[PDB]
Amino acid sequence: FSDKYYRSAYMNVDLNAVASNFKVFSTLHPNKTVMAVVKANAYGLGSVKVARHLMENGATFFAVATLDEAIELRMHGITAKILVLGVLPAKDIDKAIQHRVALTVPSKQWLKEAIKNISGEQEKKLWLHIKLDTGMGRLGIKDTNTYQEVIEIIQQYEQLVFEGVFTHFACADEPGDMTTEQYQRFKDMVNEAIKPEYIHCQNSAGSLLMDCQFCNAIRPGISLYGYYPSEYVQQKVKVHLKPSVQLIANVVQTKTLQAGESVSYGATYTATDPTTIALLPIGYADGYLRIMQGSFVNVNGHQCEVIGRVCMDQTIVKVPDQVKAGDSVILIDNHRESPQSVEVVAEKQHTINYEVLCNLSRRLPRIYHDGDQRFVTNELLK
Amino acid sequence: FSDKYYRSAYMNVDLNAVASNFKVFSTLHPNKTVMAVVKANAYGLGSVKVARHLMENGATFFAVATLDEAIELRMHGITAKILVLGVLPAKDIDKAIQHRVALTVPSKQWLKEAIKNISGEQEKKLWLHIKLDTGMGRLGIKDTNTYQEVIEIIQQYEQLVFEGVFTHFACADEPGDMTTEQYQRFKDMVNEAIKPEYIHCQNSAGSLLMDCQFCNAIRPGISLYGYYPSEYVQQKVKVHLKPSVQLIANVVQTKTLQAGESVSYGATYTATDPTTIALLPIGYADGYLRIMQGSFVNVNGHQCEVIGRVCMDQTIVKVPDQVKAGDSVILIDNHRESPQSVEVVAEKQHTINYEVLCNLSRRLPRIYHDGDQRFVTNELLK
Ligand SMILES: *Cc1c(COP(=O)(O)O)cnc(CCC#C)c1O
Ligand SMILES: *Cc1c(COP(=O)(O)O)cnc(CCC#C)c1O
Ligand SMILES: [Cl-]
Ligand code: NA
Ligand code: NA
Ligand code: NA
Ligand code: NA
Ligand code: NA
Ligand code: NA
């Protein structure tokens, strides 16, 4: 029954906006493969639906964080190339081979362990992308000799393929020399060995700000979904990105508080004079976190304050008398210049747009728009 | 049956602890039905597994927030009584009837609309619990005349059953007279009409701090899972609750930063002298939010600082030289007196324990423990 929902709170996900943003990247980098980053459930949009729609618009390569994410894509019909960006436990190597998923090599020791765990039951090629650390300081190979040795090991085993090499920028969304230094260091390492088929270093910020002619693939994530990685990037670039997400809830009913009556846990809001309130069927278990108290939402065109504590499943809003049961409320709006933009919500949460999206929980249905056609995913009813 | 998982980051969920906490409440209130609150996926633990286990230990009644949650329980074999605590859209009334789910009545107008939407295709009884507002100030009937009229409407339709009446405390977890006042107001209203089968007002805090002899059912949520609703409640009561959750990740690999090398986005941590770091395969898309930077985690017995920005899928920790790949890291510990307790994590997040648990995302497998038996749910592969 996963195409039905029974509470009027949901995310609208505009797949046409996503496809449009993908085309912007394709057009900016016409000689590169766009390796769409759909990790973390496509940043809360739903990786299965996003990846399927992107394949219909010409995507041929995805990146995810974990093998679970890659297998989830394979099980739901994705036949594109997939790279797992995290480090797979070596004992699970045969599953990556079986499912035709490319893996990240973080170190020489990982590769040696992976080789020891290949049983021979899965005989297909293992596709490998070697990760270089050029300044991010997480896992990755830092020295050129190690990079060369890993390639030489791969060359001694017919089953192992050196498919790609990559790095990742730490500060591409802010001004400074770090990004150019990382890119030059990447080239310096990659130029000391045979070149693989895929060479990639650019996230959304990198892809929006630099050509990087040396690379032949890019890895945009957040900007596919229609968000600039930072304000600095938005200010620097001319390309228009289309926000893909709205968060909507309908007023269940309105109620009148009299002077001296409080609302919600802790009695943290008390009416001074007759005040109309609206109850919304959404709360912090949906990802509309407690810190959202004091924000404004858009109730049928009116800017209305969230008052009292946000509850697990319910949120209270102070509203004008015209507001009635069934009115639509936009809590996250699909426009950057909006008091309900993802960025404004991120500022209220003292965080970044990425986290606002990731917070949106499994309890929210996703309602996908593709042209006239509409599709609903409700994870609870799987 | 049991799912596989391919990244070493997970939640341990101790079902024995949950059953033990349920028994504490049954023993505190031996003449009451314990209506176990398993809304929001049992506060992140997994409502299907929790509810099944509680039924095996004598639970006969659950409460959830939404009809989707109730149907999810029914589809996975739960045959207990279930009350939806939120307001169902009136158009969906036949689905509640079909699935034998009790509904909350918030107002006379809702009931009239619900009645208009009953088609006759589902002929089974519709079980109703009337919600009274005694101070919480959300939806609910606040006046006695309206309460009586709603009961009189229910009495005109053979299909409709007045099964229960309830209210909810705003401030039961803090000192003050509000809770006693609400309880007396509840009794004053309920005593003006015929009494239904179920009479309930106590959440975890209410159940721990008051007998409420007038009521014949209680609605504990967070304390079933082993957490006190507040520090005040913990300080006031002698009953020991057993925490049910650990959040675990294994070190993928360690690495040495030299002086002047930075880590993660924004280069927000720079080593002053040779520093060993560990990479953990968990991040803010898992619910370990960015604000956790600067916290301590427990790496194989050693207290270790989270350094640099927490990423979507990866977290960096500063570690002693003894730490190696594969070491277990406790990020949330199943002990209240711990620097990794849920309450300490909640303080770092500037929130409450409830939200820390709700934040734990669908990407984390839940590994259930029942004695020596172990069972895994991994939503990505479901
Ligand atoms: C998430 C991520 C991206 C996309 O970043 P945004 O465009 O959303 O800012 C690109 N590359 C990697 C690989 C790093 C590794 C391993 C990501 O993790
Ligand atoms: C969540 C909730 C509970 C349980 O609260 P805790 O024990 O976890 O503090 C009890 N009752 C209601 C009904 C309110 C309504 C409608 C809950 O929503
Ligand atoms: Cl990295
Ligand atoms: Na080879
Ligand atoms: Na190129
Ligand atoms: Na709460
Ligand atoms: Na009746
Ligand atoms: Na980030
Ligand atoms: Na979350």
For tokens 């968000």, name the residue: A227
Let me know: does A12 contact A367? Beta carbons within 8 Å: yes
Which of A159, A194, A224 represents a domain boundary (last residue)? A224
Residue A233 lies in a domain: no
Put the strands of the sheet holding A315-318 in their side by side order.
A253-257, A275-280, A315-318
CB B46: neighbour CB atoms within 10 A? Answer: 20
User: Which chain A residues have a beta carbon less than 8 Å from that of B281?
Assistant: 66, 86-87
Measured over the CA atoms of residue A182, residue A183, residue A189 and residue A194, the dihedral's sign is positive
A350–chain B nearest CA distance, Å:
9
Burial of residue A191 (CB within 10 Å: 0-12, 13-18, 19+) is exposed
The pair of three-digit structure tokens given for residue A48, joined into one six-digit string: 């299965």
Take residue B151 and report the two structure tokens written for it: 């009961």
B78: left (phi over 0), alpha (psi -120 to 50) or beta: beta
Q: How many angstroms away from the CA of A199 is the closest CA of chain B?
A: 21
Backbone angles phi, psi at B90, to 5 degrees: -55, -35
What separation, in Å, do the N-terminal and C-terminal C-alpha atoms of chain B show? 10
CA distance B233 to B310: 33
Tell whether B279 and B358 lie within a shared domain. Answer: yes
Q: Which two tokens stand for residue B331?
A: 């990020």
Does A251 share its domain with A311? yes
Distance CA A47, CA A53 (A): 10
Q: What share of chain A is helix, strand, coil (3-state, %, to 5)?
A: 30, 25, 45
Q: What is the 3-state secondary structure (H, E, C) of A306-345?
A: ECCCCCCCCEEEECCCCCCCCCEEEEECCCCCCCCCHHHH
- Best mutation site among A1, A7, A91 for testing chain B: the one with the most B CBs within 10 Å? A7
**Nearest Cα residue to atom 6 of ligand 1:** A221
Pocket test for ligand 1, best of A168, A201, A223, A230 (most atoms within 8 A of CB): A168
Sorted by sequence, the CB contacts under 8 Å of residue A120 that are 6+ apart come out as: none
Q: Do B266 and A314 touch (CB under 8 A)?
A: no
Dihedral sign (CA B327, B331, B336, B337): positive
A231 belongs to a structural domain = no
Which H, E and C letters describe chain B, residue by residue? CCCCCCCCEEEEEEHHHHHHHHHHHHHHCCCCEECEECHHHHHCCCHHHHHHHHHHCCCCEEEECCHHHHHHHHHCCCCCEEEECCCCCHHHHHHHHHCCCEEEECCHHHHHHHHHCCCCCCCCCEEEEEEECCCCCCCCECCHHHHHHHHHHHHCCCCEEEEEEECCCCCCCCCCCHHHHHHHHHHHHHCCCCCCCEEECCCHHHHHHCCCCCCCEECCCHHHHCCCCCHHHHHHCCCCCCCCEEEEEECCEEEEECCCCEECHHHCEECCCCEEEEEECCCHHHCCCHHHCCCEEEECCEEEEECCCCCCCCEEEECCCCCCCCCEEEEECCCCCCCCCHHHHHHHCCCCHHHHHHCCCCCCCEEEEECCEEEEECHHHC
Question: Partners of A84 in the beta sheet?
Answer: A64, A103
CATH code of residue A30 = 3.20.20.10
Rounded CA gap, B212 and B194, in Å? 19
| Cross-strand partners of A160 | A126
Q: Which two tokens stand for residue B261?
A: 């090398």
φ and ψ at A4, to 5 degrees?
-130, 155
According to the 3-state scheme, what is the secondary structure of A157-223? CCCEEEEEEECCCCCCCCCCCHHHHHHHHHHHHHCCCCCCCEEECCCHHHHHHCCCCCCCEECCCHH
H/E stretch holding A128 reads strand A126-131
Question: Is A177 found in the same domain as A90?
Answer: yes
Closest by Cα among A350, A340, A286 to A313: A286
The chain A residue lying nearest B137, using CA atoms, is A263
User: Of B179, B195, B224, at which residue does a domain stop?
Assistant: B224
Give the 3-state secondary structure of residue A93. helix
Please check whether residue A261 lies inside any domain of the structure.
Answer: yes
Residue A16 to residue B286: CA distance in whole angstroms: 27
> Which atom of ligand 1 is found nearest the CA of A219?
10
Burial class (CB in 10 A: 0-12, 13-18, 19+), A372: exposed
Gap between the Cα atoms of A189 and B54, Å rounded: 58
Same domain, A261 and A379: yes
What is the least distance, in Å, from the CA of A114 to any CA of chain B?
A: 14
For residue B318 the two structure tokens come to 């500063």
Distance CA A297, CA A292 (A): 10
Residue B236 forms part of a structural domain: no
Same domain? For A10 and A87 the reply is: no
Q: How was this structure determined?
A: X-ray
Q: How far is A337 from chain B (nearest CA, A)?
A: 25
A268, A348 Cβ separation under 8 angstroms: no
A348 is catalytic: no
Q: Are B50 and B41 in contact (CB under 8 A)?
A: no
Q: Does B233 map to a domain?
A: no
Tokens of B293: 């930077």
Residues A252 and A262 in one domain: yes
- A39 given a catalytic annotation: yes
Q: Count structural domains, chain B.
A: 2
Cβ A6 vs Cβ B71: under 8 Å: yes
Is B312 annotated to bind ligand? yes
SS3 call for A259: coil
The three-point CA angle B17-B203-B166 to 5° equals 135
Asked if A13 contacts A49 with a C-beta cutoff of 8 angstroms, the reply is yes
Rg (CA), chain B: 24
Q: SS3 for A110?
A: helix
Place of tokens 């995310």: A11
Q: What are phi and psi of A9, to 5 degrees?
A: -145, 130
CATH of residue A309:
2.40.37.10
Q: Supply the DSSP symbol for A132.
A: B
Strands B366-370 and B9-14: parallel
Q: Which two tokens stand for residue B315?
A: 């977290």
CA dist A200 → A33, A124, A165, A268, B34 (Å)? 9, 24, 7, 51, 57
Of B6, B265, B314, the CB nearest to A88: B6
Q: Looking at the domain assignment, is residue B319 inside a domain?
A: yes
Q: Backbone phi, then psi, for A241, in 5-degree steps? A: -100, 145
**DSSP type of residue A60:** -
- Quote the tokens at residue B215: 């009521």
Classified as helix, coil or strand, A368 is strand
Closest CA to B132 of B200, B224, B84: B200
Mutating which of B78, B138, B251 best tests the A interface, going by the most A Cβ atoms within 10 A?
Answer: B138
Same-domain check for residues A216 and A93:
yes
Residue type, A4: K
B358–A312 CB contact, under 8 Å: yes
B12 C-beta neighbours (distance < 10 Å), count:
18
In a domain, B232, yes or no: no
- What distance in Å separates the CA atoms of residue B256 and residue B323, rounded to the nearest whole number? 12
Sign, CA torsion A172/A178/A184/A185: negative
Whole-angstrom distance, CA of residue B125 vs CA of residue B98: 9
Chain B positions touching A41 (Cβ under 8 A) are 285, 362-363
Burial A206-227 (b: 16+ CB within 10 A, else e): bbbbbebeebbbbbbbbbbbbb
Residues A236, A209: contact at Cβ < 8 Å?
yes
Is B381's CB within 8 Å of A40's CB?
Answer: no
Domain that holds residue B70: 15-224
How far apart are alpha carbons B286 and B313 in whole angstroms? 7
Determine the Cα–Cα distance for residues B364 and B358; give it in Å rounded to an integer.
Answer: 12
Nearest to B279 among A95, A139, A285 (CB): A139
Identify the sign of the CA torsion B4, B10, B14, B18: negative
Residue with the nearest Cα to atom 10 of ligand 1? A203
Domain boundary among A163, A190, A224: A224
Query: Do B39 and B6 belong together in one domain?
Result: no
One domain for residues B51 and B193 = yes
Residue B120 lies in a domain: yes
Q: What Å distances lie between residue B265 and A102, B261, B321, B376, CA to CA?
A: 25, 13, 24, 33
Cα A165 to middle of ligand 5, angstroms: 14
Strands A81-84 and A61-64, sheet pairing: parallel
Buried b (16+ CB within 10 A) or exposed e, B171-185: bbbbeeebbeebbeb
Q: Does one domain contain both B49 and B30? A: yes
As beta bridge partners, residue B37 has B63
What sign does the CA torsion over A353, A357, A359, A364 have? positive
In this structure, the answer to whether residues B105 and B252 fall within a common structural domain is no
User: Which pair of structure tokens corresponds to residue A46?
Assistant: 């739903």
d(CA A67, CA A99): 9
Same domain for A358 and A213, yes or no, is no
Q: For residue A126, how many other CB atoms are within 10 A of its CB?
A: 22
Q: What's the rounded Cα separation, in Å, for the pair B45 and B50? A: 7
Burial environment of residue A238 by CB neighbours within 10 A (0 to 12, 13 to 18, 19 or more):
exposed
8 Å CB contact of A106 and B135: no
Q: Nearest CB to B381: which of A8, A72, A358?
A: A72
Q: Which amino acid is at A71?
A: I
- B362 contacts A361? CB cut-off 8 A: yes
Tokens, residue A292 = 């959202």
The answer to whether B164 and B199 are in contact (CB under 8 A) is yes
A318-A321-A323-A326 Cα dihedral, nearest 10 degrees: 100
Q: Which ligand is nearest to the CA of B279?
A: 3
